[PDB]
Amino acid sequence: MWFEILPGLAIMGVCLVIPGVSTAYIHKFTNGGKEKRVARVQYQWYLMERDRRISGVNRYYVSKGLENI
Amino acid sequence: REKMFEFYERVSGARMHAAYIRPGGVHQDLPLGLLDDIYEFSKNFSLRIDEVEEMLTNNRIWRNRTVDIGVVTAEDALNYGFSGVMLRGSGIQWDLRKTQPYDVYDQVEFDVPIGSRGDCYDRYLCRVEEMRQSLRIIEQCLNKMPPGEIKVDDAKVSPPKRAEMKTSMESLIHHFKLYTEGYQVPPGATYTAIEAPKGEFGVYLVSDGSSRPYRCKIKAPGFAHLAGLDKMSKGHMLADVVAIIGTQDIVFGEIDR
Amino acid sequence: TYKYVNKKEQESEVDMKSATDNAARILMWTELIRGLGMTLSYLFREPATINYPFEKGPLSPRFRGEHALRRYPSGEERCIACKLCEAICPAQAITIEAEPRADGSRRTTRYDIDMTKCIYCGFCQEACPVDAIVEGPNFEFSTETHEELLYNKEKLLNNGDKWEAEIAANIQADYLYR
Amino acid sequence: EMVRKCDPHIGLLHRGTEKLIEYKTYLQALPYFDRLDYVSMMCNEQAYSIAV
Amino acid sequence: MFFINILTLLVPILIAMAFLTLVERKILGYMQLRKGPNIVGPYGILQPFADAMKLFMKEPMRPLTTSMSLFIIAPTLSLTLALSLWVPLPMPHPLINLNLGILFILATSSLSVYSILWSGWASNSKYSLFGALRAVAQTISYEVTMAIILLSVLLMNGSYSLQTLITTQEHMWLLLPAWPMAMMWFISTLAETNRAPFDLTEGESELVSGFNVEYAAGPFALFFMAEYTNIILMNALTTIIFLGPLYYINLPELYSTNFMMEALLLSSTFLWIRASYPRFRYDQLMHLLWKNFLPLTLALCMWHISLPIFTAGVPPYM
Amino acid sequence: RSRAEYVVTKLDDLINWARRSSLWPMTFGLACCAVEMMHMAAPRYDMDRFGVVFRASPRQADVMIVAGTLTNKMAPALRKVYDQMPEPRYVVSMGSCANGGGYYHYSYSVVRGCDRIVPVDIYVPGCPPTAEALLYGILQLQRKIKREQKLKIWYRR
Amino acid sequence: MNLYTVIFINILLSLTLILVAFWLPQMNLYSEKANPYECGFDPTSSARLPFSMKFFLVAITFLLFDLEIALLLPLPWAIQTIKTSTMMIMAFILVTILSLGLAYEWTQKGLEWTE
Amino acid sequence: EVRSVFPEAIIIRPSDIFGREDRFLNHFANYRWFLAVPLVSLGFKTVKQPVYVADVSKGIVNATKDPDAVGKTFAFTGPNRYLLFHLVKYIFGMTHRTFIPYPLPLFVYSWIGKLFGLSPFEPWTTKDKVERIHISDVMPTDLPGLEDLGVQPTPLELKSIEVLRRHRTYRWLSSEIEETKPAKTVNY
Amino acid sequence: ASATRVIQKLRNWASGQDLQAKLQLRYQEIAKRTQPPPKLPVGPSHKLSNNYYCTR
Amino acid sequence: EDNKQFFGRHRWVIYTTEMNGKNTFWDVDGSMVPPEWHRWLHCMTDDPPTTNPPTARKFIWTNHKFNVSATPEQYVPYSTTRKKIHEWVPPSTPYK
Ligand SMILES: CCCCCCCCCCCCO[C@@H]1O[C@H](CO)[C@@H](O[C@H]2O[C@H](CO)[C@@H](O)[C@H](O)[C@H]2O)[C@H](O)[C@H]1O
Ligand SMILES: CCCCCCCCCCCCO[C@@H]1O[C@H](CO)[C@@H](O[C@H]2O[C@H](CO)[C@@H](O)[C@H](O)[C@H]2O)[C@H](O)[C@H]1O
Ligand code: SF4
Ligand code: SF4
């Protein structure tokens, strides 16, 4: 019966969700719990480099608020 | 097809090479219940044709692969030795079951499908419609099936029934001789032709008076059709040639013998 | 009587309605969609596949399969070496020798069937006057060597002893048609 | 991919049926006709049966 | 961590490819009133692994007339490019974030034809040369319109960035305003993947096996792995461009689940199409693209230049 | 025996299973016997559910099914395509003609059994064998492949 | 760095499969096996002889049409211009002349393959 | 030991046997994979008289019926003797592969044979194989040969191409027998 | 035969036919595999008189 | 049996796991079906051998055998006839 096609489909379906989900989680793990920063233009890269320089630990994603001034 | 192989196997014991039709009639009578099962198959088959027509007949891809492919004129088809659908696809009104009938073909009603363009698409349409006309003949055969014996009551040709063979002296002698020497055929020669599914199927059979044929020349319809492949393939691509081989409907058991 | 398969050439004028219907058919692939509908409808049909070898294709008592040599209910061989089967065999697949048995009986000393010459036509079993040689119902006897398909008398009698229960019942079901 | 000439070479299934039939009785020759157009078996039988 | 992320893309995609070979054979089977594989594993789920192990245990061909460097290179290039097409795909976040990701796809996909061209030529046999020259014709047919179709769509996106397509479709599928381009795009991806009814470079009824006819064993498997990976890729691309999966910044996995479902469905229609139609003639594919798609594609490109100006709907640069 | 012999034996099973489970015959058929081969692929028997898939290229085929009569004119071509199958390869002789010449055994033009031209693994009798009889022979080839001991024999050399 | 890393892994994976496929299986090289395939009969000539191209004119037309799309692919940046009327006229004229070029070749039978 | 339990045994002593599946012509042809062909003393101190495989089998099968063969030792050699240098050069001429010979001492050569001998599959070469390549065939004297068993020895020049054509590239596949210059022969 | 009413509607709509009335799979409509014995008739030459072979 | 299944699937056999000393847990084939059940399972009749047993004959095999090809039990052909020509045997005693 047609529903016997589904075991292969479910395996396909699981395999096609892992890349999207794994990339989203690995980004947050490696970017301080936030989305990985996107630098489309030079201005955005400049902000990341400034964030890295003021972080104290050479990581752009470690943010400094008003407690730092 | 697998269901029709069962009708073959039920009358003869073999799905394909039945050896069931013999000179004098048929080998055995139909088993009880076979006509009903042939009727059950027959009443659903036209829907199976409709589904296939739904896939191909109006499909623009199918029409692009068969329309104006392998066009053959009526005059060339006659001079090239074509027969069957290879003539009727070009409009020639010819079919041996109607023009030179054999067995009980003059007692059944059916129509001969005729092409208009002489190309692969018209020949495909002719063959689809021929299947529909076959169902029409089958229905008449089912209703008009008469009673009686199934081989000629002439024990110098047709073997006697096994019960007679085991009771009567004449039947045993005739059984013995028919399965050893065989029946003698008076000397002569005939060219006999039928409207086989692939075209005119012919035999030129020479008897010298004995129980073995002196000469048997077999006329295969596909032998002339394949000989016309070069003619039909002019100005066509390799993929068209694949279609034109299919449109001739060719089996090499009959072309090569 | 004849009919035209592709003569629908009663050329007519075209309205806006029919021209648009023709336009929609070309531009929106409607007949191609009908094709997908047909294959979709088969997707949800029960497949015709049987679970071979746990299930089998239907057969009939007339089925022509592996040959066997039969006996009378006493155990006496039915074959009396008449050679009608050998004479009729269209493949010359049968080879027979015979002599008077120790009790004076007319019996074979050789009865060979080359199963790789045989065409499984059943002419031998029609020709046999005593229902000795038959094609049985077995069709699952493929081998790993050519030599295993050159059956001698011992093999053919063992097939008879192996398959008689089914062979007898198939003959009881068909012999009135013979 | 334009086809300039088709030269069909056959005989790759030529088995000498017609010669073999000369050594057969008429009944013995019948099964050779099943194996000609082996898609239309019974029609081949019918042609040979009518001729005989 | 970036190396772990490469694994969690490549390995699941290669398993998805392997099981698409199973799904194809079962979907085709059931549309043909058969079952397809149901013995090798439960419901046939080990059949792909058996075929893979069989092929790599088989003797690989070393034909005498063959020019061996290109013969080996072509299947190697095929799988490399198929896997590379996945790295910029945002599901919703890509492994590699590219500014011109769409142009990366076209260039990478366009290099993929050379695996067919070189394998067919390098094999140095007539049926393989026929398959290579059909690939030349195939690319000429569809590549003429594929980039213009994409161009018109991306005048509503405003960039070549794949991630921007997610935001463009925040409130509506791009299918709705672009369905005529979506239709032409869908036919183009069938031809681009050499799939039926345009499976011409292999076309087994005509060329036996076309470009890969001289290939055996594991080298043959690479072409097959590359073809099934590309089918998933092109449909996933169609999903992101026209069928914008639902995106929520706090629920990224919702995008991934929705993306997979639509991508699975679009891959199924590829197998459904194969079961339904006859093959085009390869001159007829050229006429389909150049005499039907190309006129409409050019008109619609002009229309999609015109639209944002007269509706004041130019998308943002950033 | 030893644990190295046990491991070798389990590997034989694994590689044997893979070749059993993915037998790809050549698209290759000679006469009426090929029609019954089509019926084995047809829905009732559906050979593809056992993992059996026709491929037209000898380079991509594992099994040759000699399905019909082998003439002298055809014999070199059949030998050629057999030689062009990569190994491991198997031959199934199907039907009386291929098995030993059958109805045409005594012809001037016919090879009396394809096993004069190629080695044969399975002989399937019948004229033609039914689709089911052919399927039985294919399953007998699988069990033959299941018995291959190539790695065990290599280990003991 | 990341794009270089993944593409090298892609290259690395493909080459490893090739090495496995060529060194794992048992081999048996002989001349008849390695001769070119042609349906069981020998080829009558080299596959390296000229193979006529019937669509050669479409092929070189494709070269020009491929530079036309190269002129169109800056359009996403061009629609950001203040000079909207100028951009629109340039894009409209560019598409129209390309259409006229296709229309001319179509009516000259330049899209028909040679026989 | 064989004659001690079967004193009437026929003993067949072939030289190196060439043929389609040999480990002689195929072996040297496969030196192309290592670019340069080592030979002890450059192959000028080794004489070979190789014999065709179908000649040996024909002689072996004739010895099953020959009344005069029992209890004897036969030497099955080919018609011609060659120095190992010219034989290998001819092999590379027939394969149309670049022939680059260079001398290699036997003790270094044996060590390479031991390394290749470590293969757990079928070794490409062994130490024993290296030793046997550089032992000269013994000059014919006294023992009967193939002619005594009704076999005319086939020259290597008549049959080598059937063995060596598969070792050519596509450029040279169709090159005929006569394009290769035959090897120079010796009488010692 | 065992399709649900929902699937029957789906496949009837998709095909454009009434598939349930003409199923390609066979159920109980076919003949029984055991039948009563036949009794076949004899031909016109089964006569005890006026049946000399030379007249036929 | 299940007569609600379509013709072809309405009857089936579950093979034993051991027959004649052979392990048939995985290695099953159609030749394991004995003749009395072969008729029923192939639908040559509607009557199973439980309620319609076959006739008993003393020479019928009591133990069915499956296909024994490529085993020590395989059939090996041979001529079943005896020597036809008889040689002269020379005398054992000498002659002078
Ligand atoms: C510094 C130089 C070092 C010394 C170099 C010595 C090189 C000698 C290489 C010998 C050949 C090894 O190469 C390998 O040989 C085997 C068997 O020998 C052959 O391999 C294959 O073909 C033959 C054909 O009959 C089969 O017998 C064999 O079983 C199969 O594996 C190939 O020819 C090659 O795969
Ligand atoms: C032979 C080739 C022929 C094909 C080429 C034909 C090109 C001709 C194009 C005619 C259409 C020009 O359409 C023209 O669009 C511009 C903007 O783009 C409109 O311009 C309008 O909006 C712009 C902003 O964009 C305002 O700054 C301007 O004041 C206002 O007029 C014009 O009102 C309209 O007339
Ligand atoms: S079945 Fe036909 S071919 Fe076979 S032995 Fe009987 S008569 Fe001869
Ligand atoms: S089997 Fe029958 S026909 Fe043949 S020799 Fe014996 S009794 Fe006569």
Ligand code: SF4
């Ligand atoms: S064995 Fe019989 S069915 Fe098969 S090819 Fe020969 S004649 Fe035809």
